Amino acid sequence: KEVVVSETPKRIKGLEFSALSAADIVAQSEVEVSTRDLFDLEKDRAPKANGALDPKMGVSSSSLECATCHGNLASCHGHFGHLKLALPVFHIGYFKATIQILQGICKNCSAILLSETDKRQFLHELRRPGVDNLRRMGILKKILDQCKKQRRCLHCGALNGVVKKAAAALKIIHDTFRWVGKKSAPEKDIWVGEWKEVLAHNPELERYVKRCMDDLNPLKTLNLFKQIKSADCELLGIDATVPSGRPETYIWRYLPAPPVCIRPSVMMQDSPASNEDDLTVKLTEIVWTSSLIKAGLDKGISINNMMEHWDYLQLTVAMYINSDSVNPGGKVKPIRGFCQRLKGKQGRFRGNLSGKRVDFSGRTVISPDPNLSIDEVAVPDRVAKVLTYPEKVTRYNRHKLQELIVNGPNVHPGANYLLKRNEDARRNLRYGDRMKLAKNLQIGDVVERHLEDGDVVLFNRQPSLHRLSILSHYAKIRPWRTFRLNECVCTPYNADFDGDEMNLHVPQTEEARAEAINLMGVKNNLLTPKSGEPIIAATQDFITGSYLISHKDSFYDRATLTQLLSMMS
Amino acid sequence: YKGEVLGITRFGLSKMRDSVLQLASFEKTTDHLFDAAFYMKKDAVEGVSECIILGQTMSIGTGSFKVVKGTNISEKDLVPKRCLFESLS
Amino acid sequence: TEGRSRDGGLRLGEMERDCVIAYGASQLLLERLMISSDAFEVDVCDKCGLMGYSGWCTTCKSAENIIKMTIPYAAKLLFQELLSMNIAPRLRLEDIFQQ
Amino acid sequence: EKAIPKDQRATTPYMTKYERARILGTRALQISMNAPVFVDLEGETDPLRIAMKELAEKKIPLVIRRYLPDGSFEDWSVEELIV
Amino acid sequence: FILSKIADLVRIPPDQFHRDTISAITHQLNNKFANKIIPNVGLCITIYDLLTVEEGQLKPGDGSSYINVTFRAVVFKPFLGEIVTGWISKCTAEGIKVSLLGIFDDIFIPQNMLFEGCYYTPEESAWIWPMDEETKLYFDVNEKIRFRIEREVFVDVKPKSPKERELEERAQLENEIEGKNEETPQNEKPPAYALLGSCQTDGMGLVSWWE
Amino acid sequence: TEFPSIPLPINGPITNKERSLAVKYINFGKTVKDGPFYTGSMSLIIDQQENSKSGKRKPNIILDEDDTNDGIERYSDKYLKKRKIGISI
Amino acid sequence: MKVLEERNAFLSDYEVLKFLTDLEKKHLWDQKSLAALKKSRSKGKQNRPYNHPELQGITRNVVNYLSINKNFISKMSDESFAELMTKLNSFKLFKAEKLQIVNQLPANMVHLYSIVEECDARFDEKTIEEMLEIISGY
Amino acid sequence: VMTISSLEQRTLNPDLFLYKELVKAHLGERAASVIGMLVALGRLSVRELVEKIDGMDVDSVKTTLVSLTQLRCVKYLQETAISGKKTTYYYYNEEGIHILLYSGLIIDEIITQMRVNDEEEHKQLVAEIVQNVISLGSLTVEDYLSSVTSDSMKYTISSLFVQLCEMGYLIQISKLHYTPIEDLWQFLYEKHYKNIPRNSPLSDLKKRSQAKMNAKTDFAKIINKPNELSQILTVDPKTSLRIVKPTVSLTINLDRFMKGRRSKQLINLAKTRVGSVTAQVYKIALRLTEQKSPKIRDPLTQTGLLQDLEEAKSFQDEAELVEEKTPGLTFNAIDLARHLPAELHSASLINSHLKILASSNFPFLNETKPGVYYVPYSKLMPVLKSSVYEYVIASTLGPSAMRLSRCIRDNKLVSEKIINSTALMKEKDIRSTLASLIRYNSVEIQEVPRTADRSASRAVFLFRCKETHSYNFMRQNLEWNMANLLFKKEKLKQENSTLLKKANRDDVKGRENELLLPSELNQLKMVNERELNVFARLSRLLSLWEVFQMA
DNA sequence: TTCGCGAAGTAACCCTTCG
DNA sequence: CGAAGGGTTACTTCGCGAACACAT
Ligand SMILES: [Mg+2]
Ligand SMILES: [Zn+2]
Ligand SMILES: [Zn+2]
Ligand SMILES: [Zn+2]
């Protein structure tokens, strides 16, 4: 009973990139999608059960507990779901790199068109220890140029042309009758022999619609990417010892659906119900097309209508990512998914990972005050009531954080919250007993006191050109509600007391508070880094008062001198 | 140091950076992630751009080392094996 | 939340984290970007590293080698966006100790 | 990979300002977690000011481990790093 | 009673930096190997001493000395054949269920003939001894059972799934004021120490025919 | 699930020929997990078969047999019935 | 967790008590059991150590098992253990039966038959009485 | 979560899924972790082998490959660089691991090949000889005969050695077919340009006419050397009969049994092509020419890496040139082999009943047309594929599948309007069985359009065949079903291993004499019932997989 | 409704060899 | 010596960015 458990606080090293195989999409398969999915807002006062959103893929509200993570919007992580679709479809991101596999191999035997000596001559340069990414691009371009000029195959008896796009929609229209044109091929002979039989039945396209070779649709190249190799697909650039490095996982066969943590609900304008995400509307749209393309095998409707439905499928799922297509004037392209919420100026790498909104802050208009020390900012007595520092109690705090916890959240040398030793929750001092609660006060409580004089606190100016726009210097509790500081430290901020307001962040842990003042404070950063000149120094009323004491004729008595030396210090 | 006079912009940055998420935040954030999983890039995280995305300590400035607390172990407590089973009983 | 009259919470831009790197203070970037804003514990698996729930791998369904650690929520919600399209960001784990 | 013996050392015997602010932080974090002080305090709070007095009196029981680009762990002691 | 060489890393809080170094490591190792058993190594008792203790280093978020030690521990694990004294307290419809005096109460022995009779409690007696044709002595309670031990395997158990571990909340709903709540406690887990043998001396101070 | 069909499978080991091939597959799979068959691994390995491995291990190809590898494990039926030493298996 | 060896040198029963009597100061007994409500002493105002409820409960419950036979834990010394170990190695014995003899002391002949397997087919009749004279004397 | 349907590895590999499995089936994971590893990135030396398989050091990757060396499963390339040491660069062998899947049927119808002479002792003695031959990779005669301990039985075994050598089943295994054939040509080509570096005004005609053709006539002779080279056998004072040399190794020759299996496939075809009496004399007139000049199956030894410029017409012409007059024995005559005593009404058998095979080539295909015996095995293989391929797709997808798949072969680039005039489907059964077949190959459509973005639908999608894709795809699907059946066998033998270690060690004759209690004894006849069915499916699936990989 | 270089895509033309 | 194949350089098209953050 109660066996030994021991856990090591491990790091996070490396980030191995791969693609999800169809077996891995159906591994994270808590739900099964693409049966009806027009059910997510159903008749019985709108719950959901096996639709586009489920109570097995999380919670989109405060009530309605999830059936896998028994929690809510602040407890559930998220759950994926596979969406099986017939007649597979090109990946819109793996569409330029699909050619680089498919142009460098044959089209009948599907083997790589490359001599056996050049294989070792390329692997000796590619598997060298110490190959840069630029060197890898150079070698993978060097093998790419060689496999575009060999007009025939190696061990199949087949000719190969150039492979390009259709016109710029998401089709691969290539040719093979390009390199040899006079003693062309026996394939040319069987091509013109199986063309004379056609024109005795439909002479409409005898000369205009003749020069068009073939398509290379995803229904065929999925059965051709499976053929390719097992040992010579590393020359194409893909590692072949992890079981997801096969080139047929780059085509949509199974489709993962995102959780409801990705797709939230919608606020006011409550004339409809809780409105769906654009991802919800786009995900419930391809279910109808995937069921329409599947039921039409044993039903009837002809090859042109089924081709139009499959084209609508391949154009609707390729607009689910990056929305790089027209809509056959609704809005600003009317569709955002997975790249438009990741493109810069509103995305994740730009607007949620690098630059993010942070609590324990505040901004107010700046005003001048020369009577501060130069390492002292002066915050008002109401910002300090709502800016709070965790000061845990240990044997020097205990006699001070006990007279302070009876003082109250309203009186300024006081505290707002109090975290206990067992960390059940955070007790409010506004509603608590605050006399019996103030007496015990164990030595691990994380009672959070107001901001007082002597606290390390950052101070930022938003157009931060160089490193001296964010500085940290000590606090001071003052009257009327505006930030105020000296005027010698006013030139790196490029402040002019015009009405320009600046924001102010506080540290919360000891490890960052003890370095915010030590190598980032004002008194250490008196210079600039770019020149070595002192950047915080004289201002306008600093040298014009210093000049009028020294113009060879300011002669002072005893009584004026003692008053000057008294007002100075 | 790379070898050629190259730029700083979105094609001049990709000369040295094997870090993907650093390249997937500079420009063309879509195309750098689809190309890295195609080529099966390893991306050992050591740069300070990819270090605050995953939320851990950098390797520059303060985090360029670590501090170690002393133990004050004498050579008479632990270095002689205080074993009462000197003979197999 | 964003702006005024909902609640506060002010923003540290990309051109501001450039300044604090020049000081060299590395422990202030853990607070002002991860601890204060968005810190969320998560269950990751050791081999074939993905993120689970409540100590469950959900793909290598054994719940044996799951070692939890804290991560920014914008990094977790990035990964559920990357797995949603096609790509699999797999995270490997090493010890901070044993030198 | 292993540590250099103390007979020869390559780096400077000085105290860079990046290990003066880290040792001021990881000592003040230990005072907040109730470590015994080694200096006569004048009834002061704020463990940033206690660890500053520890650095001023040179009575701090820590050891700074420098890292080489190949890695040889170069153990330097704080009581002999001049500042 | 064997002696292992289990190695483990130890974190000490910054509270206890005033005590001795090897006294704070021994205090922390006793919070993990006192009653907690190692999987398929045996049952630990205490820590013997410490060995090869080096510099304790820190992480940037805790401020604790994560010191790295290796040590030997007095762990109770008998080898393939060992005579050991037990005590009977409960006898079900299955075989004899014994234990050491306050050590581990799951050392149950099934039928394992050279006993020839297995009852539950016919005349307030555990089993019947059909001797031929003298000294028909049996055993009921708290008597000097001197069984042998075998089979060495002790463990195959570690499941953990959220759809079944949160199904225990339904067992807590079944833990209501209904008295006969024999749904969840009758199906417990077999621990990492499951031990059995052959026979016990027939019965206390006697011949003990072929082990 | 999904019900396609294969023409061949049912009603075909009742005859003696397919049963003969199947039982011979069982016999080949049972014998092949024995390595060298009591006379082998000695003659033709030096004779132009991987000179860099038949020169570095000239007496060390005799590791696989059924005369000693099936011999050493059959001595232990008698060393345990007469003597007992406490060593892990 | 990395286990180096599952056994280093498996140990006897008597020096477990000798390791426990130096550990009894860590887990104090009825000689200082009256200090649960007494005055200030030991420079702590209570004279008490920390609890360890998962270790204080077992460090009393192990030695209750080690006193089962010789009640009415052995009363020998270290030099007596050395003398009974020196004279025991003169016979060709296996290590397992050495540990089973030094664990519990056989008083009669048939417990020596239960510890020493196939004693009639391996040993002589003069050795058994000498072993009983050495063991059952103390 | 319903992992019963083998969805766990649908995008895994088709080639790794069989080879690593067959290596694991006889030794285990430490041998399957190299042939399954050398099939995933190509050729590799020993130094760059250790750090990727995640295992033991060079002391284990060398030992387990010796077990693959004396089993003939890998190929090595002994060559040096201009500045480096002597490297190894091991390969993987296709037929050298087909032998492990193939050995049981090898011995079991080499029995039927050797059925001719007598009845009782020959079957058991061949089942003792060849079973020990294939279980090793290379053995001699004097090493086998050191465990007989007899005087006349040893004489019978020594007779059967040369009786198996005269058939074409035992040849001397040399290095020249133990070397990779894709680089054995290049070794016969780089010293051949080194042979003539003459300073003389010779154009690129030297690189196509002199060196290429002389390497052809020096390569085709040297690949035919292991056919018959160990023929002296004139040791008189030991035995009074032809005795095989003791210090001469022997292998299986790997290629005549290929020919016997494909001839069995031809006879199984001829049982349906011609009547019941013509196929018997066709068998007795076909099963005698397999032992003289072997080149019937093989995609040719040289055509693997030089058919890139124009040479395919020369390959077909040389194939049909040496394809005749080399087996040129009596084309239609009498022989003292076997006449099958039956009505094989015709109660007279000379020159009148043995002329019925002359009326076997003028009807539907057996294809021995021109003069007497010319071209019997060249123009069958593009249709022997097409005869078996239609009988699988018609027996699987329905009788209306061969009605649509054979129409498009007649006229490629066919419309749906003119296929309605050729077929008889009602209104929509043209396209319904097309959509039921379009997920499989041999449907492959080509599009016409001259529009911008498919405006007025342009009368597009006329159907072709592209028959070179679907044969390879059928071969992939059959090979995957093969290896999946073997993994069903492997999971069956892995499920219950606690009742197998005792059932074969000491339980031989008393298995029915109450050694197992009657609660699980039916599992012993359940682990032997459908494990018999796995090998029966394997036996009846080898007879269909090996038709799609002809020359 | 705009400049910046880097991807493909396609044509004019020169070197090299064949019979 | 005239003609055919391989290959270098030159003319033309697309897309990705365009600064921080507050109140609407
Ligand atoms: Mg202004
Ligand atoms: Zn949930
Ligand atoms: Zn090809
Ligand atoms: Zn996992």
Classify residue E135 as exposed, middle or buried by CB count within 10 Å of its CB (0-12, 13-18, 19+): exposed
Q: Nearest-CA neighbor of A212 among A225, A197, A224, A195? A: A195
Q: Nearest-CA neighbor of H92 among H156, H147, H32, H50? A: H32
Residue E187 CB neighbour total at 10 angstroms: 8
Q: What are phi and psi of A380, to 5 degrees?
A: -75, 180
Q: How far is CA H460 from CA E63, H374, H414, H419, H451, in A?
A: 73, 46, 11, 15, 11
The whole-angstrom separation of Cα H52 and Cα H41 is: 11
Q: F81 vs chain H: nearest CA distance in angstroms? A: 19
The whole-angstrom separation of Cα A53 and Cα A280 is: 8
Q: Which amino acid is at B74?
A: S
**Which residues in chain H have their CB less than 8 angstroms from residue F20's CB?**
108
G117/F84 CB distance under 8 A: yes
HSE, CB side, 13 Å, CA atoms: give it for residue C24.
15
HSE, CB side, 13 Å, CA atoms: give it for residue A72.
5
Radius of gyration of chain H (CA): 28
The whole-angstrom separation of Cα H528 and Cα A178 is: 60
Whether the CB-CB separation of B88 and B58 falls below 8 Å is answered with no
Distance, CA of H97 to C1' of I14, in Å = 53
The whole-angstrom separation of Cα A180 and Cα A188 is: 10
Helices and strands (H and E) in chain H: how many:
21, 4
The whole-angstrom separation of Cα H156 and Cα H125 is: 9
Query: Measured in Å, how far apart are chain D's first and last C-alpha atoms?
Result: 29
Classify residue H368 as exposed, middle or buried by CB count within 10 Å of its CB (0-12, 13-18, 19+): buried
Q: Can you tell me whether residue A4 is helix, strand or coil?
A: coil
Residue A332 CB neighbour total at 10 angstroms: 7
- Chains interfacing with F (3 or more CB pairs < 8 Å): G, H
Q: Nearest-CA neighbor of D67 among A341, B63, H476, H262? A: B63
The answer for residues whose C-beta is within 8 angstroms of residue G48's C-beta and 6 or more apart is G28, G35, G36, G42
HSE, CB side, 13 Å, CA atoms: give it for residue D3.
12
Q: Is the sign of the CA dihedral G39, G43, G47, G50 positive or negative?
A: positive
Question: What residue segments make up the domains of chain E, in order of their start?
Answer: 1-78, 79-211
Q: Is the sign of the CA dihedral H311, H313, H315, H321 positive or negative?
A: negative
* H209 nearest nucleotide via C1' and CA: I18
Q: Can you tell me whether residue H49 is helix, strand or coil?
A: coil
The whole-angstrom separation of Cα H287 and Cα H274 is: 17
Q: Which residue has 């370095």 as its token pair?
A: A515
Q: Nearest-CA neighbor of A482 among A365, A374, A561? A: A365
Q: Nearest-CA neighbor of D22 among D53, D44, D55? A: D55
Task: Report CA(A273)–ligand 2 centroid distance (Å).
Answer: 23
Query: Rounded to 5 degrees, what angle do the CA atoms E3, E4, E7 make?
Result: 145
On whether any CB of chain D is under 8 Å from the CB of C5, the answer is: no
Per DSSP, the residues of F48-89 read: TS-HHHHSTTSSTTTTS-SSSHHHHHHHHHHHHHH-------
Q: Is the sign of the CA dihedral G37, G41, G46, G49 positive or negative?
A: negative
Q: Which helix (DSSP H) or strand (DSSP E) does residue H388 occupy? A: helix H381-397
**Which residues in chain D have their CB less than 8 angstroms from residue C27's CB?**
22, 25
The whole-angstrom separation of Cα A292 and Cα A290 is: 5
Whether the CB-CB separation of C24 and A343 falls below 8 Å is answered with no
Question: Encoding tokens for residue H550?
Answer: 């002809």
Interface residues for strand J (CB within 7 Å) are: A 149, 151, 168, 179-183, 324, 343-345, 355, 357, 462-463, 503; B 10, 27-29, 31; C 2-5, 10-11, 13-15
Per DSSP, the residues of A424-443 read: --EEETTTS-SSSTTT---T
The rounded Cα A79 to chain-centroid distance in angstroms is 19
Residue A106 CB neighbour total at 10 angstroms: 21
Domains of chain D: 1-83 (3.90.940.10)
Whether the CB-CB separation of A534 and C43 falls below 8 Å is answered with no
Q: Is the sign of the CA dihedral H523, H529, H535, H537 positive or negative?
A: negative
Q: Which residues of C are annotated as a binding site?
A: 45, 48, 57, 60
Q: Nearest-CA neighbor of E139 among E124, E150, E154, E156? A: E124
Q: Which amino acid is at H90?
A: Y
Residue H465 CB neighbour total at 10 angstroms: 21
Q: What are phi and psi of A83, to 5 degrees?
A: -135, 95
Q: Can you tell me whether residue A253 is helix, strand or coil?
A: strand
Classify residue H347 as exposed, middle or buried by CB count within 10 Å of its CB (0-12, 13-18, 19+): exposed
The whole-angstrom separation of Cα H392 and Cα H475 is: 12
Q: Is the sign of the CA dihedral H278, H279, H282, H284 positive or negative?
A: negative
Q: Which helix (DSSP H) or strand (DSSP E) does residue E7 occupy? A: strand E7-12
The whole-angstrom separation of Cα A166 and Cα A213 is: 12
Specify the pairing of strand A31-32 against strand A81-90.
parallel
The whole-angstrom separation of Cα H39 and Cα H42 is: 6
Whether the CB-CB separation of E2 and E42 falls below 8 Å is answered with yes
Q: Is the sign of the CA dihedral G27, G28, G34, G38 positive or negative?
A: negative
B77/E58 CB distance under 8 A: no
Sequence length of chain G is 138
Whether the CB-CB separation of H462 and H413 falls below 8 Å is answered with yes
The whole-angstrom separation of Cα G26 and Cα G16 is: 15
Q: Which helix (DSSP H) or strand (DSSP E) does residue H99 occupy? A: helix H95-113
Q: Nearest-CA neighbor of H365 among H351, H352, H350, H375? A: H375
Query: Rounded to 5 degrees, what angle do the CA atoms D57, D58, D64 make?
Result: 155
Specify the pairing of strand E43-51 against strand E65-76.
antiparallel
List own/partner pairs for A495-498 with CB under 8 A and 24 or more apart. Answer: A495/A366, A495/A461, A497/A366, A497/A367, A497/A368
Whether the CB-CB separation of A363 and C85 falls below 8 Å is answered with no
Residue A556 CB neighbour total at 10 angstroms: 12
H79: left (phi over 0), alpha (psi -120 to 50) or beta: beta
Whether the CB-CB separation of A83 and A50 falls below 8 Å is answered with no
SS (H, E, C) A179-212: CCCCCCCHHHHHHHHHHHCCCCCCHHHCCCCCCC
Q: Nearest-CA neighbor of A274 among A43, A38, A74, A41? A: A41
**Which residues in chain E have their CB less than 8 angstroms from residue B78's CB?**
22, 49-53
Nearest to B78 among E51, E60, E67 (CB): E51
Question: Encoding tokens for residue F5?
Answer: 């069909």
The whole-angstrom separation of Cα C2 and Cα C8 is: 7
Question: Encoding tokens for residue E76?
Answer: 């109770």
Question: Encoding tokens for residue D51?
Answer: 């660890």
Residue E203 preceded by cis peptide, ω within 30:
yes
Is residue A339 a known part of a binding site? no
Q: Nearest-CA neighbor of F51 among H61, H86, H226? A: H86
DSSP 8-state code for residue H495: H
**Which residues in chain G have their CB less than 8 angstroms from residue F88's CB?**
6-7
Q: Which amino acid is at H18?
A: L
Q: A392 vs chain D: nearest CA distance in angstroms? A: 7
Classify residue H192 as exposed, middle or buried by CB count within 10 Å of its CB (0-12, 13-18, 19+): middle
Which residues is A534 bridged to in the sheet?
A527
Q: Can you tell me whether residue A10 is helix, strand or coil?
A: strand
Residue E133 preceded by cis peptide, ω within 30:
yes
Residue F9 CB neighbour total at 10 angstroms: 12
The whole-angstrom separation of Cα A458 and Cα A120 is: 60
Question: Encoding tokens for residue A334?
Answer: 């009317």
Which residues is C92 bridged to in the sheet?
A13
The whole-angstrom separation of Cα H403 and Cα H419 is: 11
Task: Report CA(E33)–ligand 4 centroid distance (Å).
Answer: 30
Whether the CB-CB separation of D21 and A519 falls below 8 Å is answered with yes
Q: What are phi and psi of E44, to 5 degrees?
A: -85, 155
Sequence length of chain H is 551
Residue F75 CB neighbour total at 10 angstroms: 9
Distance, CA of H476 to C1' of I12, in Å = 47
Residues 29-68 of C with CB under 8 A from A: 30-33, 35-38, 42, 49-51, 53-54, 58-59, 67
The answer for residues whose C-beta is within 8 angstroms of residue E91's C-beta and 6 or more apart is E97, E120, E121, E126, E127, E140
Whether the CB-CB separation of G14 and G102 falls below 8 Å is answered with yes
Do A and E touch, counting CB pairs below 8 Å (3 needed)? yes
SS (H, E, C) A519-537: CCECCCCCECCCCCCECCC
Whether the CB-CB separation of A525 and A468 falls below 8 Å is answered with yes
The whole-angstrom separation of Cα A358 and Cα B52 is: 15
Residues 190-209 of H with CB under 7 A from strand I: 203-205
The whole-angstrom separation of Cα A540 and Cα A487 is: 9
Report how many Cβ contacts below 8 Å link chain A to chain C.
199
The whole-angstrom separation of Cα A324 and Cα A322 is: 6
Whether the CB-CB separation of A153 and H309 falls below 8 Å is answered with no
Per-residue burial over H197-230, b = 16 or more CB atoms within 10 Å of its CB, e = otherwise: eeeeeeeeeeeeeebeeebbeebeeebeebeeeb
DSSP 8-state code for residue E5: -
The whole-angstrom separation of Cα E76 and Cα E86 is: 15
Give the resolution in Å: 3.4
Report how many Cβ contacts below 8 Å link chain B to chain C.
48
Per DSSP, the residues of D3-39 read: PPPTT---S-SB--THHHHHHHHHHHHHHHTTPPPSS
The rounded Cα A131 to chain-centroid distance in angstroms is 29
DSSP 8-state code for residue A423: -
The answer for residues whose C-beta is within 8 angstroms of residue H489's C-beta and 6 or more apart is H531, H534, H535
Q: Which helix (DSSP H) or strand (DSSP E) does residue A305 occupy? A: helix A303-316
Hey, which bits of H19-161 come out as E strands? 79-80, 86-87
The answer for residues whose C-beta is within 8 angstroms of residue H47's C-beta and 6 or more apart is H58
Question: Encoding tokens for residue F42?
Answer: 């000695």
Q: Nearest-CA neighbor of E50 among E67, E65, E35? A: E67
The whole-angstrom separation of Cα A305 and Cα H454 is: 12
The rounded Cα E164 to chain-centroid distance in angstroms is 26
**Rounded (10°) angle between helices H381-397 and H467-495:** 60
Per DSSP, the residues of A54-78 read: -TTS--SSSSS--SSS---TTT---
D21/C99 CB distance under 8 A: no
What is E1-78's CATH topology?
A: Dna Ligase; domain 1 (3.30.1490)
The whole-angstrom separation of Cα A428 and Cα A442 is: 17
Residues 37-66 of D with CB under 8 A from E: 63, 65
The whole-angstrom separation of Cα H479 and Cα H477 is: 5
